[PDB]
Write an enzyme that holds these catalytic residues in place. Structure first.
Site, PDB file in Angstrom:
ATOM      1  CB  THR A  30     -55.496  17.086 -50.315  1.00 40.30           C
ATOM      2  OG1 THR A  30     -54.602  18.169 -50.413  1.00 40.30           O
ATOM      3  CG2 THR A  30     -55.617  16.747 -48.826  1.00 40.30           C
TER       4      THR A  30
HETATM    5  C1  LIG Z   1     -54.581  17.977 -52.877  1.00 38.37           C
HETATM    6  C2  LIG Z   1     -53.215  18.256 -53.575  1.00 38.37           C
HETATM    7  C3  LIG Z   1     -55.625  18.392 -53.950  1.00 38.37           C
HETATM    8  O1  LIG Z   1     -56.949  18.371 -53.356  1.00 38.37           O
HETATM    9  C4  LIG Z   1     -54.774  18.940 -51.581  1.00 38.37           C
HETATM   10  O2  LIG Z   1     -56.102  19.482 -51.615  1.00 38.37           O
HETATM   11  C5  LIG Z   1     -53.817  20.133 -51.370  1.00 38.37           C
HETATM   12  C6  LIG Z   1     -54.294  20.882 -50.121  1.00 38.37           C
HETATM   13  C7  LIG Z   1     -53.156  21.212 -49.125  1.00 38.37           C
HETATM   14  C8  LIG Z   1     -51.909  21.829 -49.778  1.00 38.37           C
HETATM   15  C9  LIG Z   1     -53.715  22.194 -48.067  1.00 38.37           C
HETATM   16  N1  LIG Z   1     -53.915  21.141 -52.435  1.00 38.37           N
HETATM   17  C10 LIG Z   1     -52.857  21.649 -53.090  1.00 38.37           C
HETATM   18  O3  LIG Z   1     -51.690  21.283 -52.962  1.00 38.37           O
HETATM   19  C11 LIG Z   1     -53.209  22.775 -54.047  1.00 38.37           C
HETATM   20  C12 LIG Z   1     -53.823  22.210 -55.302  1.00 38.37           C
HETATM   21  C13 LIG Z   1     -54.596  23.249 -55.844  1.00 38.37           C
HETATM   22  C14 LIG Z   1     -54.093  24.018 -56.894  1.00 38.37           C
HETATM   23  C15 LIG Z   1     -54.856  25.050 -57.438  1.00 38.37           C
HETATM   24  C16 LIG Z   1     -56.127  25.321 -56.935  1.00 38.37           C
HETATM   25  C17 LIG Z   1     -56.634  24.558 -55.886  1.00 38.37           C
HETATM   26  C18 LIG Z   1     -55.871  23.524 -55.345  1.00 38.37           C
HETATM   27  N2  LIG Z   1     -51.964  23.482 -54.377  1.00 38.37           N
HETATM   28  C19 LIG Z   1     -51.794  24.804 -54.163  1.00 38.37           C
HETATM   29  O4  LIG Z   1     -52.640  25.564 -53.689  1.00 38.37           O
HETATM   30  C20 LIG Z   1     -50.424  25.339 -54.584  1.00 38.37           C
HETATM   31  C21 LIG Z   1     -49.548  25.442 -53.356  1.00 38.37           C
HETATM   32  C22 LIG Z   1     -48.363  26.395 -53.629  1.00 38.37           C
HETATM   33  C23 LIG Z   1     -47.474  25.862 -54.769  1.00 38.37           C
HETATM   34  C24 LIG Z   1     -47.540  26.545 -52.336  1.00 38.37           C
HETATM   35  N3  LIG Z   1     -50.642  26.592 -55.321  1.00 38.37           N
HETATM   36  C25 LIG Z   1     -50.738  26.573 -56.665  1.00 38.37           C
HETATM   37  O5  LIG Z   1     -50.671  25.557 -57.358  1.00 38.37           O
HETATM   38  C26 LIG Z   1     -51.038  27.918 -57.304  1.00 38.37           C
HETATM   39  C27 LIG Z   1     -52.435  28.227 -56.847  1.00 38.37           C
HETATM   40  C28 LIG Z   1     -52.984  29.396 -57.645  1.00 38.37           C
HETATM   41  C29 LIG Z   1     -54.382  29.262 -57.544  1.00 38.37           C
HETATM   42  C30 LIG Z   1     -55.167  28.902 -58.646  1.00 38.37           C
HETATM   43  C31 LIG Z   1     -56.550  28.772 -58.511  1.00 38.37           C
HETATM   44  C32 LIG Z   1     -57.159  28.998 -57.275  1.00 38.37           C
HETATM   45  C33 LIG Z   1     -56.383  29.355 -56.174  1.00 38.37           C
HETATM   46  C34 LIG Z   1     -55.002  29.485 -56.311  1.00 38.37           C
HETATM   47  N4  LIG Z   1     -50.973  27.798 -58.771  1.00 38.37           N
HETATM   48  C35 LIG Z   1     -49.923  28.241 -59.495  1.00 38.37           C
HETATM   49  O6  LIG Z   1     -48.925  28.785 -59.019  1.00 38.37           O
HETATM   50  C36 LIG Z   1     -50.056  28.042 -61.013  1.00 38.37           C
HETATM   51  N5  LIG Z   1     -48.929  27.234 -61.549  1.00 38.37           N
HETATM   52  C37 LIG Z   1     -47.938  28.085 -62.253  1.00 38.37           C
HETATM   53  C38 LIG Z   1     -46.838  27.187 -62.734  1.00 38.37           C
HETATM   54  O7  LIG Z   1     -47.467  26.294 -63.634  1.00 38.37           O
HETATM   55  C39 LIG Z   1     -48.358  25.344 -62.995  1.00 38.37           C
HETATM   56  C40 LIG Z   1     -49.467  26.161 -62.420  1.00 38.37           C
END
Ligand SMILES: *[C@@](C)(CO)[C@](*)(O)[C@H](CC(C)C)NC(=O)[C@H](Cc1ccccc1)NC(=O)[C@H](CC(C)C)NC(=O)[C@H](CCc1ccccc1)NC(=O)CN1CCOCC1
Ligand SMILES: *[C@@](C)(CO)[C@](*)(O)[C@H](CC(C)C)NC(=O)[C@H](Cc1ccccc1)NC(=O)[C@H](CC(C)C)NC(=O)[C@H](CCc1ccccc1)NC(=O)CN1CCOCC1
Ligand SMILES: *[C@@](C)(CO)[C@](*)(O)[C@H](CC(C)C)NC(=O)[C@H](Cc1ccccc1)NC(=O)[C@H](CC(C)C)NC(=O)[C@H](CCc1ccccc1)NC(=O)CN1CCOCC1
Ligand SMILES: [Cl-]
Ligand SMILES: [Cl-]
Ligand SMILES: [Mg+2]
Ligand SMILES: [Mg+2]
Ligand SMILES: [Mg+2]
Ligand SMILES: [Mg+2]
Lengths: 222, 233, 196, 195, 218, 204, 222, 195, 196
Positions: free
Chosen positions: C1
């Site tokens: 983000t």
């Molecule tokens: C930017 C991108 C980074 O700061 C923004 O902050 C955004 C915020 C918006 C969306 C509100 N963040 C994200 O897009 C965020 C990045 C992220 C990932 C993991 C931990 C913290 C932040 N993305 C997500 O939360 C996604 C959104 C889904 C796909 C709708 N979720 C994942 O990536 C999940 C999260 C699981 C998780 C891990 C650790 C802490 C909390 C949640 N991860 C997966 O599904 C793992 N994935 C499996 C396939 O192989 C790649 C990894």
């Protein structure tokens, strides 16, 4: 799995493949991934097969009770809120990745839910192992103001992309169309492009081939 | 044992009736940082072959130098260096494929995925893949990284099997490639809008297109998307 | 983000990109990271999509229940509710939230809440992965009591650079304007902001 | 704890259980009886984790004895074995499971038949003509497969059992200090003092 | 992938020379890779080796041994001793100690100066001379039948059966042993093959004729 | 230490013309050591048959549990439970233990007494229902059974022919698995008669 | 950390007749859940009426075939164009594989042809060189599915003569090239249904005294 | 490999070495001689890692025998023990060390005195009146401390040794299948066949 | 570290901070990260102090030996020698080097060599921990063919921000000017650049 959802003029359509895997083995060649939460709110599910079934049934049950309690047709946002809060509580351990869609007194809706409890809004969505193959098709052919017949075509094409190009997906295409002011039509096995060819030989054994040690009549009655 | 530092993303390619098309964006990523924007990841060898490389850029530049040196070496004591004994795509590929597997076997790989696109002397299309593991394969459509997951499905709708190749024109094939590059820009977090595209035709020869951009994008519908479920404003 | 919130003469403006990622795959390219917890109190969401949504939903509930009893809450009050959740559940949360709101007494206010759960009231705030690349730019270019058009340009130029360098940021630039006039949504597409 | 065997013959069940108790590099005792009488016509041998074995055995013993007093009636070996299995089946998913394997030799007075049950620490019950726990089985089972007949006498069973102990004493790495043999039949439970 | 690990093998000395008996099963985890594996390597017309542990390691190095034995008798104009032949193999695997070779083998032969001789050789360098040896996952089962029935004054007919019965005993109980039984009889004038015996047919044949395995219904 | 493959075993179920067949091996072991050749894995509650592979203690426990539940069902409902209903009960019961599951691969088989329709179903350890027209497989030689069933099976087999197909599927699958075999049982189930046959197989 | 191995999937199958032998293998090449090629042949004519396949990790498979093909070439140079017999080829391959005992070729190798009496021959190898002649062998991802079917249909295992009380076995006999190809095609269509890494196409190489013939058949592409 | 003992008395050195060879859960052999004659009046017993023990013993044996032939002279036990220690002292810092512990019993013909040397796998040499390797020492040393006298006869030494073996057989967990006893004196090396 | 090199009309200017750290302790607050490999070919050093020094010393040796045989080397040649060392020893090196030089034919040139050992010729280059914070600023403010005074101001303002936000950067701002005129060293102290 491959699953998709596509919004159109007067409603929403969702679709899914029918392959169920166990490691590299295809356990079910024609399983149903489209779930009925309420009569006009349907759910496509990817991920842990037991979880998508269990969570969709539980929320569907509570939605029915809620509908009876409020004397109102249930809303998609209610199912969405109830599903996400449940999944979030379990911190992703309930491995259910859902595309939630339907029509209600507010209108037509299309959402996606992930296992950790995050939700997303869109006109076209895809989830599962073959989501990238599906999304590629959706990104190439989607437009605003789709008709019913166009949205079904786009949705089933997106599933097909997954069927052919993704090893996690295969077999048939299930579709469910949810239009406003009409009954939702569940089109089980909408496409069946993976019919097994005739076998070269019949393997019907001559009777008595198998060696037997004992025989006995089993009592099933009281 | 390596870890890749400055990296290049998807290389996509396909066959058409008279030749082959290959494309790759001009980005050199440093993890999440989109560090370098003027990186050419398609490298022509002669007038009949283009080698598209993804993965580690330092190793890509090493491979550039090897190919450059291969042309020099081939010219030595070779009166037919620009004729019958010119470098073929198949020669260039097999050389790289040998190097990639030898390096993986010494546990010191060139951290890349390479696609060698070209046209042979007899007019036959050449398109074959090789990577850090020394794994090789050929197909009517080939792609690396995210391209494998997103481009191939789209390119296979045009050329699904061998018999579809004579039926596919350069106009139709290029359109599918450019469309695939747009989809990758939508969906690959380590991709750039700017890219290079190369066509190797058996009649018109090598056409190398630089400074292309993804265009005709759909973003307008974003304005209608509010909140993440219940929000109305 | 990449997210930010900037106070100005007439009130405050929130800004955000629209990229959601799973590794290097973009799960959603048209995400709305600017979310309403009250009529004129909004927040920018960075970090976990699930955690920030869960948090924002709870805050909206708390502020709705506050309003039913005690009338409209202050922007400070909203930031305190966010903090309480983020601080007390710091071990299980990945959420970087910027709270921004408009009072008539206090005008535009911006509070930032990083991972720890601490609260920081600022003239403007930047956050998210792509914010690292625009600390230099934003510090040099920010002025207090800017006009609406100047503040929109400041956010647009800033997030344009954040997007340009951060792979984890992209898509459209959403903005939300909070003033006495009301609530205005703005959107800006790649073709405009990329060539700034 | 190591070697426990069991042989069901025509008219009795014979249990053989090693006498050694080893802790570290020292044999602390060479006359340990690894068995408890659950009821007049039911005997349970046991082997496994230190402490757990005796604690479990006596807990079962108490429960069966409580049942006997309450109903003024002896539970069948099958009934006792099912009760024991369930206790272990509960145990395996507990915070700290009983790591105890048992053999239950009993004479059913209603059926006039000897019965041998083998139950491991997971709660895996099987009725057998001859059984063993631990590494003992790896030698004895094949030996019993060969020499065992279902119509054997108690004396023939003891000779067959001697043959097993001899093989174990020859090929087992550890010195288990011989066995205590006990017979369960229509007349109850008695110990063979010279083996 | 996992690689083949076909096992029950035995070899014992007696009045009429040596008996060698092996099973035929080879596994990769629970998966039965082959029921028809040859676990007796015919090093040369006078020497036999058994296969346990690494299938490749045993095959490769015991045919290699046959080459070293042939070179010995070409240079020395005399048959190689069982002691010498076994030591060539044990010294070789000792050079590879630590590298991960996996071998449990009986080198069996019958010479003038030694008589019938069996050497257990091991991939961790162990070399043992002995009268009875039993190696593999089902070795303990085969030992029980061997130890209770073995005598030096067995006939060639009875010794052959004892070896066959001991493998059967292991094939039954040990999940990773079975398929079929291969018998060999080693004399001073060379080894003599005594056929392949399917366990499926042998079990029912033995059960009826011997009265054993009353636990199993037939 | 993989619960599903300590004891070993297999179950297979097939449909035919107005009939179903369910079959299982008899082995119970402790890894390499074979312990029992009498351990049946198929149980029945009224006319509904349940086969269970996996960890033996759970196989026993679940049988006792479904006997328990089908007995109370019958007392309250005043009728025998049907295959479709039992399938749901098995699923409910397994998913109840979602985060501490029974390590099993159950298989329901039977004929609905009202409609007369042949029915089979399989489950994973946490209760996901796998319904099938043709066949269901389970156990340590599932891969083998899948391969046998997919090639040997054809629809609408008569009870006598169906017996040969399911028996050959089980036997040849079991012989390619170390932890399966040691005897086999086959249940042929018609509308109002059930025949149980013990198969002669190799005992290694 | 760098992992030098990979799994390219696929599956192969060798059957030996009286005066012929077949070596089949699907044409699908994969990594994880992606298809790399729908037609990437992995059964090769190596000369001297020897066909070969090294299924598993393709890079190691291709290296091995390449080295064996080269071995056949140098066998001709060094030994006056002598024909390399199938048994000699097998022993040679053992030394190729075992040569890398401590850094193996991750492949299940199968070769097929005719022995020196003119009869059909199939040899199978583990990754480190242990080999054995057999009538029948499946190798690769779906080997566990195909192999028990082959035991039943080629070697007539568990099949007894009807009415003989399971006392007389079904007699062994050689199969015709027509009957073998039927079993190959049914084995692969079955494997394709239940294994995700198997499909796209089937290429069979048949070896008789006349030479090496090829046959190709489509397989399901999902 | 496990139990090796040594007792130096007035006029001889006595070495006792266990007969068992165990691999896994099977005693493969019960008549193994864990010793090599290095020279007519020098005997070395050994215990440790499988393979290494015999390979090391025979390597030393060969080297000493080579010396004997070259100089037509027998090395003193002290000289042999120093050579052995140095070989192990080199070994410990090698790529793959010999994991072998040895006792060297010898009769010095020039001094007319028996000599017992204990050397572990690190190359740690000590001359002792009585010695042991492994867990054996933990029982025997205290027993020898009590009963041992420096002026004992060979027959008194054998009785003292019997007392050690009896104690080991009572308290040791593993069955080591008795011992082979050998005596080294002015007349050379001979084996006690009945022990 | 925060380092940069910028080409302009008359040639090229190299810029750097002066902070060397061991964890959070500043081992040297007056470090000279701008180092000469040839008369008018210099480099900016970031990463390991030991590795970058070792590398720079070897390059200086190579270029001195080059000059003795073949005359003055090109700036490209110098960058190639740096690359060769950094690429071939990538497993054992932590060095982010910017090579900058002045030819009379080629004028000012800048080559950047990141961790991998790859080479990138650019109009200007930024590197080191503190460079992350000024990608936005530098991209917006860089122009080609700047004057000497403009380029000095560009570097000063840029490194001022890098220093301000990066804890791993600080002290004085050293600069080295490479033109046809010769070699000029510049220094700028906290009291000046902090209040920019
Ligand atoms: C930017 C991108 C980074 O700061 C923004 O902050 C955004 C915020 C918006 C969306 C509100 N963040 C994200 O897009 C965020 C990045 C992220 C990932 C993991 C931990 C913290 C932040 N993305 C997500 O939360 C996604 C959104 C889904 C796909 C709708 N979720 C994942 O990536 C999940 C999260 C699981 C998780 C891990 C650790 C802490 C909390 C949640 N991860 C997966 O599904 C793992 N994935 C499996 C396939 O192989 C790649 C990894
Ligand atoms: C595509 C097809 C995935 O490739 C879809 O996403 C579908 C979703 C549909 C079916 C709703 N997903 C699956 O088919 C899914 C893939 C999968 C596997 C494992 C974990 C997550 C996802 N398959 C399953 O869920 C199967 C359903 C069976 C075939 C009916 N279940 C299993 O594979 C279970 C996994 C159960 C599980 C437990 C704990 C955490 C997560 C999952 N595995 C087994 O049964 C294997 N094994 C049998 C022996 O006993 C031990 C367990
Ligand atoms: C900025 C600071 C970061 O990019 C600059 O790049 C400068 C470059 C200038 C000095 C040329 N970098 C540093 O100051 C550099 C930071 C660093 C540290 C470790 C690895 C890479 C870069 N600092 C150093 O190299 C110092 C300089 C010494 C104190 C004179 N050295 C250390 O910190 C040593 C380095 C050991 C090392 C580790 C890994 C790779 C190479 C070298 N570290 C220690 O002594 C450990 N120290 C022990 C006390 O507890 C704290 C850690
Ligand atoms: Cl979101
Ligand atoms: Cl320095
Ligand atoms: Mg067996
Ligand atoms: Mg597919
Ligand atoms: Mg260094
Ligand atoms: Mg600072």
């Amino acid at each position: 799995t491959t699953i998709v959802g596509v919004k159109f003029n007067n409603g929403v359509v969702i679709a899914a493949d029918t392959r169920s895997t166990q490691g590299p083995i295809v356990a079910d060649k024609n399983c149903a991934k489209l779930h009925r939460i309420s009569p006009k709110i349907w759910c496509a599910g990817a991920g842990t097969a037991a979880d998508t079934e269990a969570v969709t049934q539980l929320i569907g049950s509570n939605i029915e009770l809620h509908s009876l309690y409020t004397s109102r047709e249930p809303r998609v946002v209610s199912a969405l809120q109830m599903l996400k809060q449940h999944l979030f509580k379990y911190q992703g351990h309930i491995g259910a990745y859902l595309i939630v869609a339907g029509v209600d007194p507010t209108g037509s809706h299309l959402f996606s839910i992930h296992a950790h409890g995050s939700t997303d809004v869109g006109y076209y969505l895809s989830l599962g192992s073959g989501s990238l193959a599906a999304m590629a098709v959706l990104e190439s052919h989607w437009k605003q103001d789709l008709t019913k017949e166009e949205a079904i075509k786009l949705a089933s094409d997106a599933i097909q992309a997954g069927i052919w190009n993704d090893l996690g997906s295969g077999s048939n295409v299930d579709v469910c169309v949810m239009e406003i002011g009409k009954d939702a039509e569940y089109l089980r096995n909408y496409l069946t492009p993976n019919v097994r060819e005739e076998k070269q030989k019949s393997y019907k054994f001559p009777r008595g081939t198998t060696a037997v040690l004992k025989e006995s009549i089993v009592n099933i009655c009281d | 044992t390596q870890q890749p530092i400055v990296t290049g993303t998807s290389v996509i390619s396909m066959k058409y009736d008279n030749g082959v098309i290959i494309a790759a964006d001009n980005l050199g990523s440093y993890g999440s940082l989109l560090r370098f924007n003027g990186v050419e990841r398609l490298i022509p060898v002669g007038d009949n072959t283009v080698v598209g490389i993804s993965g580690d850029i330092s190793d890509m530049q090493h491979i550039e130098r090897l190919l450059k040196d291969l042309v020099t070496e081939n010219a030595y004591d070779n009166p037919l260096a620009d004729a019958e004994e010119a470098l073929e795509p198949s020669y260039i590929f097999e050389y790289l494929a040998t190097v990639m597997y030898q390096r993986r076997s010494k546990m010191n790989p060139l951290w890349n995925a390479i696609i060698v696109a070209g046209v042979q002397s007899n007019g036959d299309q050449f398109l074959r893949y090789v990577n850090l593991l020394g794994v090789t394969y050929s197909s009517p459509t080939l792609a690396t990284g995210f391209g494998a997951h997103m481009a191939n499905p789209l390119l296979r709708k045009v050329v699904d099997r061998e018999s579809d190749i004579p039926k596919t024109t350069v106009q139709v094939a290029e359109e599918a490639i450019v469309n695939a590059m747009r989809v990758l820009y939508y969906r690959d977090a380590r991709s750039s809008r700017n890219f290079s595209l190369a066509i190797i035709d058996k009649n018109t020869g090598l056409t190398f297109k630089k400074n292309l951009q993804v265009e005709n994008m759909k973003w307008d519908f974003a304005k209608d998307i509010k909140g993440y479920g219940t929000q109305k404003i | 983000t990449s997210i930010m919130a900037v106070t100005f003469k007439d009130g405050v403006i929130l800004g955000a990109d629209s990229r959601t990622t799973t590794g290097a795959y973009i799960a959603n390219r048209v995400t709305d990271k600017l979310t309403r917890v009250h009529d004129k109190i909004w927040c920018c969401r960075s970090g976990s999509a699930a955690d920030t949504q869960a948090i924002a939903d709870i805050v909206q509930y708390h502020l709705e229940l506050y309003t039913s009893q005690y009338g409209t809450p202050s922007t400070e009050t909203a930031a305190s509710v966010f903090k309480e959740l983020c601080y007390e559940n710091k071990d299980n949360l990945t959420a970087g939230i910027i709270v921004a709101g408009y009072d008539d007494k206090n005008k535009g206010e911006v509070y930032t809440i990083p991972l720890g759960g601490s609260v920081h009231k600022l003239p403007y705030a930047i956050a998210g992965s792509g914010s690292t690349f625009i600390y230099g730019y934003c510090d040099k270019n920010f002025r207090e009591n800017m006009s609406k058009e100047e503040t929109v340009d400041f956010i647009k130029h800033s997030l344009s650079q954040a997007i340009k360098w951060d792979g984890s940021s992209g898509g459209v630039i959403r903005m939300v304007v909070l003033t006495a006039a009301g609530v205005e949504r703005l959107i800006f597409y790649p073709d405009e902001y990329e060539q700034l | 704890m190591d070697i426990i065997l069991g042989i069901r013959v025509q008219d009795s069940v014979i249990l053989a259980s090693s006498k050694a108790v080893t802790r570290g590099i020292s044999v602390l005792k060479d006359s340990d009886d690894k068995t408890r009488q659950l009821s007049p016509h039911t005997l349970m041998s046991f082997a496994g984790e230190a402490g757990d074995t005796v604690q479990f055995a006596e807990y079962i013993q108490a429960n069966i004895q409580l049942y006997s007093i309450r109903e003024d009636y002896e539970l069948s070996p099958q009934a006792v074995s099912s009760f024991v299995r369930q206790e272990l089946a509960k145990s395996i998913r507990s915070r700290r499971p009983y790591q105890v394997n048992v053999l239950i030799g009993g004479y059913d007075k209603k059926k006039n038949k000897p019965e041998l049950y083998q139950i491991d620490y997971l709660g895996t019950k099987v009725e057998l003509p001859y059984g063993a726990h631990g590494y003992s089985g790896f030698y004895t089972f094949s030996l019993l497969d060969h020499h065992y007949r279902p119509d054997m006498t108690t004396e023939e069973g003891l000779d067959l059992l001697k043959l097993c102990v001899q093989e174990l004493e020859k090929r087992m790495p550890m010195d288990f200090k011989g066995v205590i043999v006990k017979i369960v039949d229509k007349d109850g439970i008695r110990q063979v003092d010279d083996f | 992938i996992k690689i083949a690990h076909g096992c029950t093998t035995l070899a014992f000395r007696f009045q009429g020379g040596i008996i060698v008996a092996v099973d035929s099963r080879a596994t990769a985890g629970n998966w039965v890779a082959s029921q028809t594996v040859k676990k007796v390597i015919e090093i040369n017309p006078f020497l036999l080796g058994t296969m346990a542990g690494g299938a490749a390691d045993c095959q490769f190095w015991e045919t290699w041994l046959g080459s070293q034995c042939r070179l010995h008798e070409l240079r020395e104009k005399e048959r190689i001793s069982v002691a010498a032949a076994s030591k060539i193999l044990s010294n070789l695997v000792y050079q590879y100690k630590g590298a991960g070779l996996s071998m449990g083998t009986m080198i069996c032969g019958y010479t003038r100066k030694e008589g019938p001789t069996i050497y257990y050789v091991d991939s961790d360098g162990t070399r043992l001379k002995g009268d009875i040896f039993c190696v593999g996952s089902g070795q303990t089962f085969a030992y029980g039948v061997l130890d209770s029935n073995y005598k030096w004054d067995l006939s060639v007919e009875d010794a052959l059966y004892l070896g066959k019965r001991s493998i059967l005993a292991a094939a039954h109980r040990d999940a990773y042993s079975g398929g079929s039984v291969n018998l060999y009889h080693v004399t001073e004038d060379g080894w003599i093959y005594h056929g392949n015996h399917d366990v499926g047919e042998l079990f029912w044949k033995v059960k009826e004729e011997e009265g054993s395995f009353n636990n199993v219904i037939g | 230490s993989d619960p599903s493959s300590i004891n070993g075993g297999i179950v297979v179920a097939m449909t035919g013309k107005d009939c179903v067949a369910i079959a299982c091996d008899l082995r119970l072991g402790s890894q390499s050591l074979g312990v029992s050749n009498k351990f049946e894995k198929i149980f029945h509650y009224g006319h509904v048959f349940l086969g269970i592979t996996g960890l033996a203690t759970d196989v026993t426990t679940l049988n006792e549990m479904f006997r328990y539940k089908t007995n109370l069902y019958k007392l309250k409902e005043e009728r025998a439970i049907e295959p479709e209903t039992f399938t749901q009960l098995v699923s409910s019961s397994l998913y109840e233990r979602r985060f501490g599951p029974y390590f099993v691969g159950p298989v329901v088989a039977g004929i609905n007494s009202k409609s007369g329709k042949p029915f089979i179903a399989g489950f994973d350890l946490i209760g996901c229902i796998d319904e099938a027209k043709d066949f269901i497989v389970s156990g340590t030689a599932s891969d083998q059974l899948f391969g046998m069933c997919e090639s040997l099976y054809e629809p609408n087999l008569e009870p006598e022919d169906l017996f040969e197909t399911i028996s050959q599927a089980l036997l040849n699958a079991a012989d390619r698995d170390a932890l399966s075999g040691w005897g086999a049982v086959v249940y042929i189930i018609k509308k109002d008669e059930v025949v149980k046959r013990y198969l002669k197989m190799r005992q290694d | 950390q760098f992992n030098p191995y990979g799994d390219n999937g696929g599956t192969i199958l060798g059957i030996a007749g009286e005066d012929f032998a077949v070596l089949a293998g699907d044409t699908r090449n994969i990594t994880d859940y992606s298809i790399n090629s729908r037609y990437e042949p992995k059964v090769f004519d190596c000369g001297d009426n020897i066909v070969m396949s090294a299924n598993g990790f393709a890079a190691d498979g291709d290296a091995l075939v390449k080295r064996f093909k080269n071995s056949v070439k140098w066998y001709h140079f060094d030994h006056n164009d002598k024909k390399l017999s199938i048994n000699s080829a097998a022993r040679n391959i053992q030394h190729l594989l075992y040569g890398k005992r401590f850094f193996p070729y991750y492949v299940h190798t199968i070769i097929a042809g005719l022995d020196e009496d003119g009869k059909g021959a199939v040899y199978s190898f583990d990754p480190v060189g242990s080999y054995e002649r057999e009538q029948c062998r499946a190798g690769g991802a779906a080997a566990s599915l195909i192999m028990p079917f082959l035991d039943n249909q080629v070697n007539f295992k568990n099949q007894y003569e009807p009415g003989t009380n399971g006392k007389v076995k079904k007699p062994l006999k050689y199969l015709s090239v027509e009957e073998v190809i039927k079993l190959v095609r049914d084995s692969f269509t079955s494997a394709t249904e239940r294994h995700i890494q198997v499909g796209d196409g089937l290429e069979i190489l048949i070896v008789t005294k006349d030479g090496v013939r090829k046959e190709f058949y489509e397989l399901k592409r999902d």
